[PDB]
Amino acid sequence: MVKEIARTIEIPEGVSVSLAQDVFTATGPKGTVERKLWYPGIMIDVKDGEVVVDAEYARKEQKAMVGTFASHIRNLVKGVNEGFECKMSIVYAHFPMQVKVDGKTLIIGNFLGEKKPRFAKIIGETKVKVSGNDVTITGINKEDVGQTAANIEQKTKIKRFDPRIFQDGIYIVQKA
Amino acid sequence: VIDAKGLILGRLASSVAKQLLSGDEKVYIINAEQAIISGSRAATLREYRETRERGATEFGPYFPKRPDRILKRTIRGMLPYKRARGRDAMSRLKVYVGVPYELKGAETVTIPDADMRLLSSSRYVELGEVSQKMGSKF
Amino acid sequence: MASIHRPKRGSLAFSPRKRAKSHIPRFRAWPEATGEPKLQSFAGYKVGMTHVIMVDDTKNSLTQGMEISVPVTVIETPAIRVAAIRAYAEDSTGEKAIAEVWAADLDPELKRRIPIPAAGNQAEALENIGKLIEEGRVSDVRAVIYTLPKSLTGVPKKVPDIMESGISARDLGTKFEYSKTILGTLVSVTDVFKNGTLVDTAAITIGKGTQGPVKRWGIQLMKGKHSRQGSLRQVGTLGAFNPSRVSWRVPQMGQMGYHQRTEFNKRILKIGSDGEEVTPEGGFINYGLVRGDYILIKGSVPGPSKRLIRLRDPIRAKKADLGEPNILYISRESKQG
Amino acid sequence: KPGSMYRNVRQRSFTRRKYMGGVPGSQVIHYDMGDKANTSFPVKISLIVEEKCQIRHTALEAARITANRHLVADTGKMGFYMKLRVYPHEVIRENKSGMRRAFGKNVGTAARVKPMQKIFTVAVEKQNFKAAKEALWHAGQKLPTPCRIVVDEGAELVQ
Amino acid sequence: MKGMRSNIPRALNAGAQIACVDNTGAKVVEIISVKKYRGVKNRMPCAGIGDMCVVSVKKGTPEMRKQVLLAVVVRQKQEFRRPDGLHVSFEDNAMVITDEEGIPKGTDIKGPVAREVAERFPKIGTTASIIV
Amino acid sequence: ARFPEAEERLLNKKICMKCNARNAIRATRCRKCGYGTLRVKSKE
RNA sequence: AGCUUGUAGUCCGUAAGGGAGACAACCCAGCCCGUGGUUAAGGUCCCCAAGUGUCGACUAAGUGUUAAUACUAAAGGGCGUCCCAAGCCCCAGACAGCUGGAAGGUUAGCUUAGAAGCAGCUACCCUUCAAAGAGUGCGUAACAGCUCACCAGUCGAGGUU
RNA sequence: GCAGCUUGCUACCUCGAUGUCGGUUCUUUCCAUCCUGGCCGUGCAGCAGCGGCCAAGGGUGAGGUUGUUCGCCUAUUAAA
RNA sequence: GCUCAGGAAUAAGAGCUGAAUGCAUCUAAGCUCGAACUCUGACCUAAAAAGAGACCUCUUUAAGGAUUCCGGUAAAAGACC
User: For B118, which residue in chain A has the nearest alpha carbon?
Assistant: First the structure.
């Protein structure tokens, strides 16, 4: 049938979305988030608790860009409304990992017996909690939460040995 | 006094060079760091580091580093600068990073056909980015 | 052809190897301010070398705690005068001098270097600099200082040497206040450097005049049969057939020595006031005896005796707080023996 | 001895074997594969070269081997019919001193084919069309020319 | 290896025929190469006190002779400075046969050994009668 | 032991058979070179 | 082979001037002197005289910005992107996701005490059923939970070769 | 297919001379990388290998025979 | 005697978010890491940078420079101190 490129994003109540200049800004009960979403040939309008993203043209690049921008807007509104949570587990064989939070970084001491602790960077206002053997990562930005989890998982990489024997590290069990 | 912000580098250079060769004015260009170079950032950086590190730089080509001096070089490449006419043209041209204090508050102009919003994509970088990735302090 | 490789003869990190344009070393960088205000540099004159017996206090060293003989350079360091305060404005084109205030009263022998600035505007010059700092036209402040070699006797010259020094402070206002406090005063080397600390030494090296590539770059001589075929101390080849030119990287004869050099991490082993503690019997050869206050620098320093040596706080120091050296014996035996 | 040597057609034909001497025999043994007697195969595809080239007998044998192996594996021993239409008629010679009396000695045989000329034809049933097509693509990978497969019969039987 | 307290000039270069001063049956050994030594173009392998060299037994018993062995130089005529500024020199050069680990093949060492080798390889010190 | 949640991230990816790059478990083609055949990372 | 040796035409040789960056022989052109105009080849963003010319599309690779020329890289591949056409499925609801069962067959026969559906050679294995095979997976010394090929409800538009 | 670093083919330049091999000295460049740095796979437990990708900043040595290039051999070496 | 670095931006590569293609996807945009590379950063040189510089002081028949004299931290002549 008729192919429509335009996409619609509902604005939940309590959420104010604005697109002054070429920057999206969503304010919600859980916080405020700001992203840059500018692409020539793509137009974004905000109106009556509903954002519409359309492409002037209809080629595959414009279809992909309207899809990506609509998904980003949806993720921003979901972050400002209900947020995002990511679950990671701590597993080790012989050395008990000492995992803690020292502010905007996560300290991972005794990783595989190392005398120098690993440092994992925290992104944005992302709250990381080490609840014993697991890590919860809550935030208002899916980008920030996913990157914090990725930073943890990559800092806990065993870059030398056979992965089928050495499996120590911190691994995401649930994405944002 | 031309404001180079959001202007295509080569098209601004061509316009200014042809004006200088028409030869009735002194041209000042400000915010040379804010000029635009279309194309992918990786490709532009690759070509510009190649040009910067190319020559027999002890006794060969000496490609500049500051964005204003790079823009001056770009205009120089579009002039008969070995001739008396091109020498006068380059002598009548001054390029600045940002706005110099003496030209502060002066009335500027912009080339409508050099505007960057006529580009069809987002594949571009700024001359200031190129200069600072080549290691210029400005 | 399967070639044997060698590292290049000499360093191209000091090219062109020309004569230094002045007899005074100029500092191109100043380190970070990490405490109370003070000058970041001093200037003395190299006297000579001696050696001390000291207890190895260097942490983690194999010989730590035992007697070790350490060569030291003696540097005679009379008090320098803070002649002026200069303010620098930062813009896109770099730093520019924006203001300078000279001290009201300056030493009469400064006329051997420059016509003496009069006792004119100092209060209003300082208030102008304060206004400039308040309005944001000043990026930083440096102190112009000069040495007073007339008090020395191994240095024949009475004309002072003038140089800019950084001020170490946490903020520009603190820098300006400290510079106003120290302006026109006589600063001692204890007011710049403390004993046991690391410094960087800049100096003009020993001049050797025109030297061949063998001595100048350390190129090999011709060997065996080639040693007596007429090109013994002489480079084998100036270049290939193509490119049709002699590269600037080919070792060649030219000026050797009398360059500016910076040595890093020279430790101060003693800040002394009486030169009789270090002067040997018979005096230092071609210099004489120390009379004023002096400094002992662990190891060697660039420059010959009587050369002006500039000391600055370290810019690439590795080790943390080192301590006070335990000098158990300063050798004053005759250096001429 | 790369196939790029005797690949381009720059010369007249060289085939009259009674005026030459000592041509090595061709490596290609069979020219009809699969089920030779049956002719009621509905689908019938062919491989056509799209350039004017000379194909050596060794290249022909390699393509025949690969196509026959693929067809026998997929369709079975008698699930297909395969015909190699061209025979190596041109005599390839080589100059084995230098360039004096450079007229070469006969080193092999090649088939001089024209653009759009059929090289191999494979007949199969409806359900074996993709297997025949894949095998003939593999065969075309061994030839010194770009090739394309065309459906001769069974176009409506395939789609 | 473990650092020595003294500064040792690498005095013996490859080809030097040194007297062997233990009871292994080797009287004179010629230095072939120096272990753990990387050189530069045209520079002969150099060894000072405390260094381990590959040697060939030129004189001595017929069983020792022509064998490629490891030796440690224990005496050198080239002067070396102790940390406290005193310069030490021996009357001759002298080596002792050892393994890779540093254990001497001989049982007693005639002549004084250097304290530097005596500390770097403790078994040479125990084998030697006096350490200077 | 071998932990399933670690194994999911470490051993549960496809490998390109021409450039050895890791790819998603559902990927039918290599992202680096576009190769159409990918094998699961050999976990034994 | 910018190799060697023929043939037809035309050139350089002996051919200016204009244009291709320069170019013996490539394009215009064969050229007495001076002046004016209009054109050829080629070009019109600047260097450089004249278009930042018009219309309709493509390219994201600085690819390209290279009539001929020996001065311009191939086979193969691409769910990169833009087109044309033909099959099949599709609001009697396609394609992909969200759900719920994979209960009767068999533990099919396998020397050595033991791989009893994944070493293995073979089928109108159920009456009939909107639904369950002589076997698609990290895993089994002989057994299993945990994943499929299948019709079912789901939002609801094209999907696939 | 690439390179033009082997050997051929050719005869366009040089026969009113462009001094012929190898070594030595000194400088520079390429990457198709021997080591050093970062990665991926493994029939990768570790040690250590094997295969591939990026990367030319630094290093790539000392000796016996032979004029040798090349090659053989010796002992070091991260590699020679 | 002295002669580590740190930071930025990247290659291969590993990931996050993410559509085309409801799902998935390191990629098509976007984002984070990531080398002895590159840049910066502690070094040398550099107003002959033709945009041929900034500041201050002294003085305009002066300031100051050179020559002669006694020299050497310098030096082939010059120059330099």
Answer: A40
